[PDB]
Write an enzyme that holds these catalytic residues in place. Structure first.
Site, PDB file in Angstrom:
ATOM      1  NE  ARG A   1      -4.333   1.721   1.475  1.00  0.00           N
ATOM      2  CZ  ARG A   1      -4.939   2.798   1.973  1.00  0.00           C
ATOM      3  NH1 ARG A   1      -4.460   3.402   3.063  1.00  0.00           N
ATOM      4  NH2 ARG A   1      -6.038   3.266   1.380  1.00  0.00           N
TER       5      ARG A   1
ATOM      6  CG  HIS B   1      -1.661   5.253  -0.752  1.00  0.00           C
ATOM      7  ND1 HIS B   1      -2.446   5.752   0.262  1.00  0.00           N
ATOM      8  CD2 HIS B   1      -2.468   4.456  -1.495  1.00  0.00           C
ATOM      9  CE1 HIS B   1      -3.669   5.261   0.154  1.00  0.00           C
ATOM     10  NE2 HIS B   1      -3.711   4.473  -0.906  1.00  0.00           N
TER      11      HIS B   1
ATOM     12  CG  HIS C   1      -7.956  -4.161  -2.441  1.00  0.00           C
ATOM     13  ND1 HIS C   1      -9.000  -3.346  -2.823  1.00  0.00           N
ATOM     14  CD2 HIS C   1      -6.974  -3.331  -2.008  1.00  0.00           C
ATOM     15  CE1 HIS C   1      -8.666  -2.082  -2.630  1.00  0.00           C
ATOM     16  NE2 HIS C   1      -7.447  -2.046  -2.124  1.00  0.00           N
TER      17      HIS C   1
ATOM     18  CD1 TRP D   1     -11.353  -6.268  -0.519  1.00  0.00           C
ATOM     19  CD2 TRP D   1      -9.503  -6.030   0.732  1.00  0.00           C
ATOM     20  NE1 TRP D   1     -11.086  -4.919  -0.416  1.00  0.00           N
ATOM     21  CE2 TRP D   1      -9.962  -4.746   0.353  1.00  0.00           C
ATOM     22  CE3 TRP D   1      -8.346  -6.131   1.523  1.00  0.00           C
ATOM     23  CZ2 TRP D   1      -9.304  -3.572   0.733  1.00  0.00           C
ATOM     24  CZ3 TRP D   1      -7.697  -4.958   1.902  1.00  0.00           C
ATOM     25  CH2 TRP D   1      -8.179  -3.698   1.509  1.00  0.00           C
TER      26      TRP D   1
HETATM   27  C1  HEM Z   1     -10.053   2.580  -6.487  1.00  0.00           C
HETATM   28  C2  HEM Z   1      -8.819   2.305  -6.047  1.00  0.00           C
HETATM   29  C3  HEM Z   1      -8.504   1.940  -4.574  1.00  0.00           C
HETATM   30  C4  HEM Z   1      -9.176   2.303  -3.463  1.00  0.00           C
HETATM   31  C5  HEM Z   1     -10.457   3.167  -3.379  1.00  0.00           C
HETATM   32  C6  HEM Z   1      -8.492   1.731  -2.323  1.00  0.00           C
HETATM   33  C7  HEM Z   1      -8.864   1.870  -1.001  1.00  0.00           C
HETATM   34  C8  HEM Z   1      -8.305   1.206   0.068  1.00  0.00           C
HETATM   35  C9  HEM Z   1      -8.740   1.302   1.447  1.00  0.00           C
HETATM   36  C10 HEM Z   1      -9.913   2.180   1.956  1.00  0.00           C
HETATM   37  C11 HEM Z   1      -7.945   0.510   2.181  1.00  0.00           C
HETATM   38  C12 HEM Z   1      -7.994   0.257   3.697  1.00  0.00           C
HETATM   39  C13 HEM Z   1      -7.009   1.137   4.459  1.00  0.00           C
HETATM   40  C14 HEM Z   1      -7.038   0.710   5.906  1.00  0.00           C
HETATM   41  O1  HEM Z   1      -8.088   0.871   6.571  1.00  0.00           O
HETATM   42  O2  HEM Z   1      -6.014   0.185   6.405  1.00  0.00           O
HETATM   43  C15 HEM Z   1      -6.991  -0.123   1.297  1.00  0.00           C
HETATM   44  C16 HEM Z   1      -6.022  -1.013   1.686  1.00  0.00           C
HETATM   45  C17 HEM Z   1      -5.068  -1.576   0.870  1.00  0.00           C
HETATM   46  N1  HEM Z   1      -4.825  -1.246  -0.456  1.00  0.00           N
HETATM   47 FE1  HEM Z   1      -6.255  -0.318  -1.675  1.00  0.00          FE
HETATM   48  N2  HEM Z   1      -7.398   1.023  -2.783  1.00  0.00           N
HETATM   49  C18 HEM Z   1      -7.366   1.130  -4.155  1.00  0.00           C
HETATM   50  C19 HEM Z   1      -6.407   0.568  -4.968  1.00  0.00           C
HETATM   51  C20 HEM Z   1      -5.281  -0.137  -4.568  1.00  0.00           C
HETATM   52  C21 HEM Z   1      -4.140  -0.466  -5.400  1.00  0.00           C
HETATM   53  C22 HEM Z   1      -4.041  -0.032  -6.875  1.00  0.00           C
HETATM   54  C23 HEM Z   1      -3.247  -1.164  -4.653  1.00  0.00           C
HETATM   55  C24 HEM Z   1      -1.860  -1.729  -5.055  1.00  0.00           C
HETATM   56  C25 HEM Z   1      -1.610  -2.306  -6.235  1.00  0.00           C
HETATM   57  C26 HEM Z   1      -3.818  -1.290  -3.325  1.00  0.00           C
HETATM   58  C27 HEM Z   1      -3.255  -1.943  -2.247  1.00  0.00           C
HETATM   59  C28 HEM Z   1      -3.775  -2.015  -0.976  1.00  0.00           C
HETATM   60  C29 HEM Z   1      -3.285  -2.901   0.063  1.00  0.00           C
HETATM   61  C30 HEM Z   1      -2.150  -3.925  -0.017  1.00  0.00           C
HETATM   62  C31 HEM Z   1      -4.144  -2.612   1.280  1.00  0.00           C
HETATM   63  C32 HEM Z   1      -4.062  -3.271   2.662  1.00  0.00           C
HETATM   64  C33 HEM Z   1      -3.135  -2.419   3.521  1.00  0.00           C
HETATM   65  C34 HEM Z   1      -3.014  -2.998   4.912  1.00  0.00           C
HETATM   66  O3  HEM Z   1      -3.512  -4.127   5.151  1.00  0.00           O
HETATM   67  O4  HEM Z   1      -2.388  -2.329   5.768  1.00  0.00           O
HETATM   68  N3  HEM Z   1      -5.042  -0.645  -3.315  1.00  0.00           N
HETATM   69  N4  HEM Z   1      -7.231   0.336   0.016  1.00  0.00           N
END
Ligand code: HEM
Ligand SMILES: COc1ccccc1O
Ligand SMILES: COc1ccccc1O
Length: 293
Positions: free
Chosen positions: A47, A51, A174, A190
């Site tokens: 993430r 970001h 995800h 997820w």
């Molecule tokens: C429409 C596009 C996306 C949206 C709206 C989105 C939104 C989110 C949200 C709300 C979270 C939860 C944050 C938390 O509460 O810890 C999250 C987690 C995460 N995102 Fe996405 N994301 C998007 C695309 C992506 C992309 C493109 C990647 C990487 C290729 C990604 C990788 C991750 C990962 C690995 C987590 C888990 C982080 C953790 O467990 O600490 N996301 N995302």
């Protein structure tokens, strides 16, 4: 007049140097295995890489991975980046041991290392991002909202020069980690594995029975009987007919998903960077397992 950011290899460094940095990250991922109820730092590092890259704007080449601008207060305090401080703290001892690696190279390499160590595809990676000053930090608000639909997702990703296939592939990340209510206003994983990179995200979208519910932060999310969740933006991938076709494709072809994710993720991490004609070729790092370490 878009900015030009030319990759400049850290002086005298080569593959072996970067493999050492990869190894240090990988060894620490193995070591620090209690974080986030034993998920470990893999997902948060992915993430963080996303970001730090996802601020890019193709129109003027602002944001992007090059400058390593997350190290600056404005960006690390972005509400969209809540919780990423854990990834940054993880990388601190890596930066201390290898102070020669640029901030952008370290953030992006953290993501690559995490994906590979979690049994994901190889992600070719190129060095040469160069730290840029505080005033180059992009304003907050360039990262995507989760409460939106397919039209929003499609339009958002055009700014990052991603097409439908690239978007759907990238969203498969995800499979990893979870949402945390206090960080984003969403709660739950997820899927089941959390720290193994697979095509589980697509399988779950298609195969689980989803109910649109309100979480404890009064936000809507899709919940399954298995205890999984999908953000409205995740669920939009099966509401839109074009996205749906691609979801089915990746749910039914692990290798294809790996190949496409690898290309899109490298692309994401390299957006905005001009690589000289005589720059080194992309590096493909061996996992700890491949090295017998
Ligand atoms: C429409 C596009 C996306 C949206 C709206 C989105 C939104 C989110 C949200 C709300 C979270 C939860 C944050 C938390 O509460 O810890 C999250 C987690 C995460 N995102 Fe996405 N994301 C998007 C695309 C992506 C992309 C493109 C990647 C990487 C290729 C990604 C990788 C991750 C990962 C690995 C987590 C888990 C982080 C953790 O467990 O600490 N996301 N995302
Ligand atoms: C124990 O957690 C991990 C180990 C290796 C790679 C990523 C992780 O989250
Ligand atoms: C400039 O310091 C850092 C850069 C990237 C990741 C961790 C750090 O401590």
């Amino acid at each position: 007049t878009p900015l030009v950011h030319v990759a400049s290899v850290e002086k005298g460094r080569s593959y072996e140097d970067f493999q050492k940095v990869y190894n240090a990250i990988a060894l620490k991922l193995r070591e620090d295995d209690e974080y986030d109820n034993a998920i470990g730092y893999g997902p948060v590092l992915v993430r963080l890489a996303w970001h730090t890259s996802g601020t890019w704007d193709k129109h003027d080449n602002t944001g992007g991975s090059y400058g390593g601008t997350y190290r600056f207060k404005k960006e690390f305090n972005d509400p969209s980046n809540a919780g990423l401080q854990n990834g940054f703290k993880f990388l601190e001892p890596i930066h201390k041991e290898f102070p020669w690696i640029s901030s952008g190279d370290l953030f992006s390499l953290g993501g690559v290392t995490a994906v590979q160590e979690m049994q994901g595809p190889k992600i070719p990676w190129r060095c040469g991002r160069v730290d840029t000053p505080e005033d180059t930090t992009p304003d907050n608000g360039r990262l995507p909202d989760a409460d939106k639909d397919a039209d929003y997702v499609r339009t958002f990703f055009q700014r990052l020069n991603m097409n439908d296939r690239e978007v759907v592939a990238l969203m498969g990340a995800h499979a990893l980690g979870k949402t945390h209510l206090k960080r984003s206003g969403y709660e739950g994983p997820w899927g089941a594995a959390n720290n193994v990179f697979t095509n589980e995200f697509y399988l779950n979208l298609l195969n689980e029975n989803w109910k649109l519910e309100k979480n404890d932060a009064n936000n809507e999310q899709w919940d399954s009987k298995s205890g999984y969740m999908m953000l409205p933006t995740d669920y939009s991938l099966i509401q839109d007919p074009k996205y749906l076709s691609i979801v089915k494709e990746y749910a039914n072809d692990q290798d294809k998903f790996f190949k496409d994710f690898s290309k899109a993720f490298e692309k994401l991490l390299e957006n905005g960077i001009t690589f000289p004609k005589d720059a080194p070729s992309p590096f493909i790092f061996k996992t700890l397992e491949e090295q017998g370490l």
